[PDB]
Amino acid sequence: FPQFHVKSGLQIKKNAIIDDYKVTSQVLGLGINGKVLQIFNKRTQEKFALKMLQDCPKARREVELHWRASQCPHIVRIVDVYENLYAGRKCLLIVMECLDGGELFSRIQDRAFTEREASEIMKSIGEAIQYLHSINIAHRDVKPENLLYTSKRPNAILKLTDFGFAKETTPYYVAPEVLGPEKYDKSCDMWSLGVIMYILLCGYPPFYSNHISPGMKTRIRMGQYEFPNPEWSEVSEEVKMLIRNLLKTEPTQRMTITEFMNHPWIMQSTKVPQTPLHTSRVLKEDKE
Amino acid sequence: PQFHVKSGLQIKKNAIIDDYKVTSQVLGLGINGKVLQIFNKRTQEKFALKMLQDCPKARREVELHWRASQCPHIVRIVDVYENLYAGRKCLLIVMECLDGGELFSRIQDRGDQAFTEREASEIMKSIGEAIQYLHSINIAHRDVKPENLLYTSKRPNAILKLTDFGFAKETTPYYVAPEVLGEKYDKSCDMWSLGVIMYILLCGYPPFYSNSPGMKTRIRMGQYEFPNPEWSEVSEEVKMLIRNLLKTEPTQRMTITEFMNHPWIMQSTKVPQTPLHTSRVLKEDKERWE
Amino acid sequence: PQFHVKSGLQIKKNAIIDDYKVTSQVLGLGINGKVLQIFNKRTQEKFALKMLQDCPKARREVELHWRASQCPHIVRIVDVYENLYAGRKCLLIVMECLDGGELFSRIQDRGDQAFTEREASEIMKSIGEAIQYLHSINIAHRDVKPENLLYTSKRPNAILKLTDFGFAKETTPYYVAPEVLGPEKYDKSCDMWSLGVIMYILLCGYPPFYSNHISPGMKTRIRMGQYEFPNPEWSEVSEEVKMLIRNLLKTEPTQRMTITEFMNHPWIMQSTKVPQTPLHTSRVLKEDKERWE
Ligand SMILES: Nc1nccc(Nc2cc(-c3cc4ccccc4o3)c3[nH]ncc3c2)n1
Ligand SMILES: Nc1nccc(Nc2cc(-c3cc4ccccc4o3)c3[nH]ncc3c2)n1
Ligand SMILES: Nc1nccc(Nc2cc(-c3cc4ccccc4o3)c3[nH]ncc3c2)n1
Secondary structure: OOOOOOOOOOOOEOOOHHHOEEEEEEEEEOOOOOOEEEEEEOOOOOEEEEEEEEOOHHHHHHHHHHHHHHOOOOEOOEEEEEEEEEOOEEEEEEEEEOOOOEEHHHHHOOOOOEHHHHHHHHHHHHHHHHHHHHOOEEOOOOOHHHEEEOOOOOOOOEEEOOOOOOEEOOOOOOOHHHHOOOOOHHHHHHHHHHHHHHHHHHOOOOOOOOOOOHHHHHHHHHOOOOOOOOOOOOOOHHHHHHHHHHOOOOHHHOOOHHHHHHOHHHHOHHHOOOOEOOHHHHHHHOOO | OOOOOOOOOOOEOOOHHHOEEEEEEEEEOOOOOOEEEEEEOOOOOEEEEEEEEOOHHHHHHHHHHHHHOOOOOEOOEEEEEEEEEOOEEEEEEEEEOOOOEEHHHHHHOOOOOOOEHHHHHHHHHHHHHHHHHHHHOOEEOOOOOHHHEEEOOOOOOOOEEEOOOOOOEEOOOOOOOHHHHOOOOOOHHHHHHHHHHHHHHHHOOOOOOOOOHHHHHHHHHOOOOOOOOOOOOOOHHHHHHHHHHOOOOHHHOOOHHHHHHOHHHHOHHHOOOOEOOHHHHHHHOHHHOO | OOOOOOOOOOOEOOOHHHOEEEEEEEEEEEOOEEEEEEEEOOOOOEEEEEEEEOOHHHHHHHHHHHHHOOOOOEOOEEEEEEEEEOOEEEEEEEEEOOOOEEHHHHHOOOOOOOOEHHHHHHHHHHHHHHHHHHHHOOOEOOOOOHHHEEEOOOOOOOOEEEOOOOOOEOOOOOOOOOOOOOOOOOOOHHHHHHHHHHHHHHHHOOOOOOOOOOOHHHHHHHHHOOOOOOOOOOOOOOHHHHHHHHHHOOOOHHHOOOHHHHHOOHHHHOHHHOOOOEOOHHHHHHHOOOOOO
16 A cells, blocks of 8 residues: 655754855856855765755745655755854755756757757656646746756766746546646746757757847747758657647647657657757857 | 527426325435435326525526526426425426436446447437537536436437536627637536546546546646557547547637537447447446445 | 837827818728728828827827838828817827728629639738737737728729727737746737638638527527538638638637737648639628628
8 A cells, every 4th residue: 555655854954054064166057046056065075056045935935846846856856955044044055966967958069969869858857847747836947057967977867956936836527627726837837848849959949039039029929930941951740740839829728748748759759760950069159 | 480489487386295296216316405206196207306495506506407408418397396395495396207327327237238439429429419508508517427417218219318407507790709708617627527428438437546646636637548458449539539628728628519510429320330348347347336 | 230110100289181181971980980081182192081089098099000000911090180179189090091992892893703712812811911910019909800901992903901990909048938928818819710700701701600680699609619611612612721710710719829820821821822712702792792781
């Protein structure tokens, strides 16, 4: 009879963090809610990440959510959380596993890149969002810089981070709506999969400037994007048809993750053609 | 001339015993009280009775079922009485008696072990109509599940009829838009229901069940599947249909009109007579008592 | 550096009679004001005047109509006056005069014959461009009907244009998402049900939804999303046209298509590739006429 649906709660440590870590000044990632500093476990040398919040309702929420989320091996692990006094104020100090193999597009950006790595990547991010949605959490800021590789070792796991914007989203014949209203917060995660998938396939976003920005906003609202050659020349209608169903402008039209995750292109990611893509070249050139 | 005028409800105040012997045979137990066997004094016939305590939910129910009962696929209301029962005001609903049994029974003891794909379409079309009449007069039934689907008799050509309006609600220029005419998401649920029923109907078990905070997650997520053996003869078209009914976002679900114009439904008598496992699996589990 | 700035609306206050002979022959007639023919005294030319009474609503009409005016598929405001009429303050909108006829009128000025499916495609592409222009600057027209779609002249290359902004309303690298940048109700998607209605008519010559006298019939048939493609009329309209109609006449506002999708549709986009197939539309239009009655 089911057990390991039982995992430990979060005990918030109250001792000062510097008992346990050396807080260096290296910013790993500026991020939301403050910054993200690299720190070091004192009694094992090992490497970790700190993000600091002034304590409040919002912050207790970030911590509650990210904690529930750490279960999933594609969300970045919360190792420890401290309540400490800093400069007179209460703080939550969030100690994360340190992921240091780079940002998704950063890694891609320096090497060839195939449709198949695209799909594999997209399966991964796909699992992180399936897990959030199944325990009723919407992330709400899935973006390139929140998608990080663990090491620089070429099978690094990719992991989703930053719960600064996350919200709880809340008879065998009862319909989903009858088990209580979901707003529509859960489908921006899906738009996001869309935008990432697009970038992965070609090196640039479906919607950008021209500095052209009242024009970008229209283009977004209007859902005007396209699949220009050369980059999209060898990309199958199947793949294009998927992005179109994520980038729908009407949120109640997009696919759910369950539908995403069942798509033959994600489900059998390891069977997709290894078709060579521009992603990495477009990525060196378009740095600017 | 005018053939679309049907008559209003005229509640009798006369005590129901003037006309009916009220037996004690329980017949059904959903929502409010219970439905009993009763007999027409002057003619001897078999009829059903629902005990409602007057109050505002009761008056709604009678009102909607009366509008509903025009349809040949919805249990007919023969008379509504307003009587006084142990001092309390009471609405007593005399329905036609449907003694053929619930859908899944008549299906489980199908003697001739031969439930075909086609019979499934014929049933589904008939559940269709009931939902279509309902929706076309702005009622959402809101409790469409198999125990509310009963056969009139045991006759080989008995009709299927929907019952129980304990939860029914009203959902309230040639070019105007549906939105502009005036209606919340209050009626896609009937349309989910149908998906669940077709699912069971084609294979014998529900697409969603206990392992149950699980099952609730599974529903909320739309996690179901068409396992073999049972679904292996079932064509991609027919489970596209299910897919669009089981859509979790209510605005993406299909609507009865789309459903009723699906060719699998529209042209029943020309869907193949492929054997299904329904009747075996329904028989296998007296688990359906929960 | 590029700068695509077009000017603002300067409401003139000088009495309009200074500028225009004002006749009384009525070109048309709106909810909120009938449309009169006028002549410019200097150039001697032919214009249309719509008379409004000053208020928030009137000023909102004018400001939207002026913005939309930039689009070559919309009837263009040429001038706006604020004058005193019968001791009432008034908004006098001057517009280009279009005397080509309403869309369906022009269609039944032919016996000849052959209104073909490609021509229909072209016509929808033209109404579609008016809706894309509007919608891309966050206006919803909201009364897109056969009777507000006017040809410029009876000449052979008259332009189809949309008019009447008396019901219109406004609204409100990067990864944000259409919602997460300002809300926005569904006033837009009804413009889109209208293209479907107009498309339906165009393809066979009678509406998808009518009162049989059965107008509670019709109200119902509309909420149901209940119509069909009868033969003989639809017998050789391709399936894809019917499916485009289906996307447009979805009863769920959020299910319907967007003009961006509409305009990217192959039957709209690659017009020159749609069959030249004859169509019962002019005949039916002509047979019917009881439209007035
Ligand atoms: N929860 C949260 N909220 C907000 C922000 C945030 N950023 C963040 C960023 C990096 C990063 C980026 C990078 C780039 C190169 C090398 C190491 C690198 O490390 C991280 N590595 N490990 C954890 C971690 C967390 N995380
Ligand atoms: N309106 C309403 N509200 C609530 C409940 C409800 N149940 C109900 C049930 C049966 C039934 C069930 C059954 C089972 C076996 C044989 C004959 C059987 O008959 C009925 N037969 N006729 C009318 C009728 C109405 N009906
Ligand atoms: N802005 C606005 N608001 C409300 C209404 C409205 N109707 C309208 C109508 C006609 C028309 C119709 C017609 C039919 C035949 C011949 C000439 C014809 O001219 C017009 N011609 N030119 C401008 C113009 C504006 N316009």
